Write an enzyme that holds these catalytic residues in place. Structure first.
Site, mmCIF file in Angstrom:
data_model
loop_
_atom_site.group_PDB
_atom_site.id
_atom_site.type_symbol
_atom_site.label_atom_id
_atom_site.label_comp_id
_atom_site.label_asym_id
_atom_site.label_seq_id
_atom_site.Cartn_x
_atom_site.Cartn_y
_atom_site.Cartn_z
ATOM 1 N N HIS A 295 1.125 -5.924 -1.964
ATOM 2 C CA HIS A 295 1.217 -3.953 -3.089
ATOM 3 C C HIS A 295 2.524 -4.668 -3.434
ATOM 4 C CE1 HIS A 295 2.681 -3.350 0.690
ATOM 5 N NE2 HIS A 295 3.951 -2.641 0.539
ATOM 6 N N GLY B 100 10.108 -0.111 2.981
ATOM 7 C CA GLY B 100 10.948 -0.940 2.681
ATOM 8 C C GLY B 100 10.557 -1.901 3.917
ATOM 9 N N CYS C 31 7.851 -3.186 4.512
ATOM 10 C CA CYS C 31 5.887 -4.650 5.153
ATOM 11 C C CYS C 31 6.787 -5.302 5.021
ATOM 12 C CB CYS C 31 6.210 -3.359 3.604
ATOM 13 S SG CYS C 31 5.083 -1.785 3.413
#
Lengths: 306, 306
Positions: free
Chosen positions: B41, B143, B145
């Site tokens: 993503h 942020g 991830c």
């Protein structure tokens, strides 16, 4: 979201850990540039620890009696010096992994990360607080002495703690990196009293603010209070008193959450006098005091390092 | 002595973290050899996350649309591939800090360390468990991830987790390093139910053994019990049932402490049905389930790593 007792990333420290052997005893050392720092009681056998004369013991030792090992490479000791309770072992090669570092003497209530080591090899990392009685509630087995505590400014490692002793009460004692013990302790195997340990109030308040930020609000009470009246109650529960400096430090957390510091104090005061009644805060059934106001802002804002 | 929720030393992982940018979105990637692994993503804007067609979105992206950065050096993306929920970004240079690594799919109840990162830069390390419902109760801001979870065998890093999503309930979800989600979750911003979370019983027993080893014995009760009768009570308190495999795993801890596993079960059973009555175990007022039997033996015996 979420909140965890986060340690600093340990890489910059891992490459500084060495194994120091003097006689039969082996513990950990800190290899910065061309100095290896380690507890001076590396020169002691089990018998010497009961009543060590370090000057006399050190004089019976020579440079060639210290075996510094880093992985499968050996360091040659070209000089040895005793600074208070640390041995400075000057070796012939400067650690190529030497980070930008600082030696700092932290104050009680400050937090830092410990890289627990055995035989000069890292086994784990955890975050702890320097208690107000200058002990730490660590996890140290035999051979973990010389493990260090540190903080990381973005690119600068601040070494603040070297482990020396487990007190007979099972708590841990050590020095700054100039060899000065935190607290009244000496590096001899004798019964040593740590003072009354108090709870670090400004840290508990910081953690309350973290709980608000993460959605735990039930403790926000109907009351307010004064700094004099709060300190009256905190003294009863073995909480250290709150100063205006502590209020000033909590300023940003108060601004972010819209909760004045004295209003949070009223909530904490109620928590103390009435407990938490089988409820939790950030997963804990106890009030947590090993997060400083800076730890909370760091974690809630996600500051990073080199 | 003493017991702490210890994370693995993070150095071997820190040198693998990179910053991945696709369009406006930036998150963390894992640079092993010549592949950068990151959540797919990264190709999504905030709008796409509500209903992303990853195949279609990826096709609109080209190699030159992925900016991989490591410190102040830029990596050139020479190829991109989607494996389940991970993007494999082949870059032109193999990470010189690539450790000996393994990709593993861990089972619920297993523990691992998370290196929390922002912009490809490490901010902290903490140890957690994979819940039985395949979530983790982490600390992840926006942020973070692409932050990874890992275990360290002596010289071999076992990557087991990559962070992808914070569920609207504030818990965290992610995949193994082949991109397969732990649990029934998908990488889309929609309401997603995690199953009932249970307590990891074999871990609680492990931690009880750690408490005995460290001198906390008051819970050793006058009773014993059977594995069938213990599981009856554990089911009531949302504890996962105990198997003979779990008993076999606790064998060494039983041998070291002289306490049969079923005797410890009787103590735990009493703890469940009657609580801890304002007392603590290893500093906790709650029963801890994020130590596996291997974590306890590791910490109580001081095993080290490269």
């Amino acid at each position: 979201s979420g909140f965890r007792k986060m340690a600093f990333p340990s890489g910059k420290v891992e490459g500084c850990m060495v194994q120091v052997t003097c006689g039969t005893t082996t513990l950990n050392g800190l290899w910065l540039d061309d100095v290896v720092y380690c507890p001076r009681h590396v020169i002691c056998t089990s018998e010497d620890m009961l009543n060590p004369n370090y000057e006399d013991l050190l004089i019976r030792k020579s440079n060639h009696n210290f075996l510094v090992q880093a992985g499968n490479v050996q360091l040659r000791v070209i000089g040895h010096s005793m600074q208070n309770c640390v041995l400075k072992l000057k070796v012939d090669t400067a650690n190529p992994k030497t980070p930008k570092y600082k030696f700092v003497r932290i104050q009680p209530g400050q937090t830092f990360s410990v890289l627990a080591c055995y035989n000069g090899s890292p086994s784990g990392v955890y975050q702890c607080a320097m208690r107000p009685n200058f002990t730490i509630k660590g996890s140290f087995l035999n051979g973990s002495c010389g493990s260090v505590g540190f903080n990381i400014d973005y690119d600068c490692v601040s070494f603040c703690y070297m482990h020396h002793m487990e007190l007979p009460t099972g708590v841990h004692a050590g020095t700054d990196l100039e060899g000065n013990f935190y607290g009244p302790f000496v590096d001899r195997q004798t019964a040593q009293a740590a003072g009354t340990d108090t709870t670090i109030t400004v840290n508990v308040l910081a953690w309350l603010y973290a709980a608000v930020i993460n959605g735990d609000r039930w403790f926000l009470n109907r009351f307010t209070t004064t700094l004099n009246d709060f300190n009256l109650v905190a003294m009863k529960y073995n909480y250290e008193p709150l100063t205006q400096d502590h209020v000033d430090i909590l300023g940003p957390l108060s601004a972010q959450t819209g909760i004045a510091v004295l209003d949070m104090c009223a909530s904490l005061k109620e928590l103390l006098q009435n407990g938490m009644n089988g409820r939790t805060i950030l997963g804990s059934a106890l009030l947590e005091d090993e997060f400083t106001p800076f730890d909370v802002v760091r974690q809630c804002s996600g500051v990073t390092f080199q």
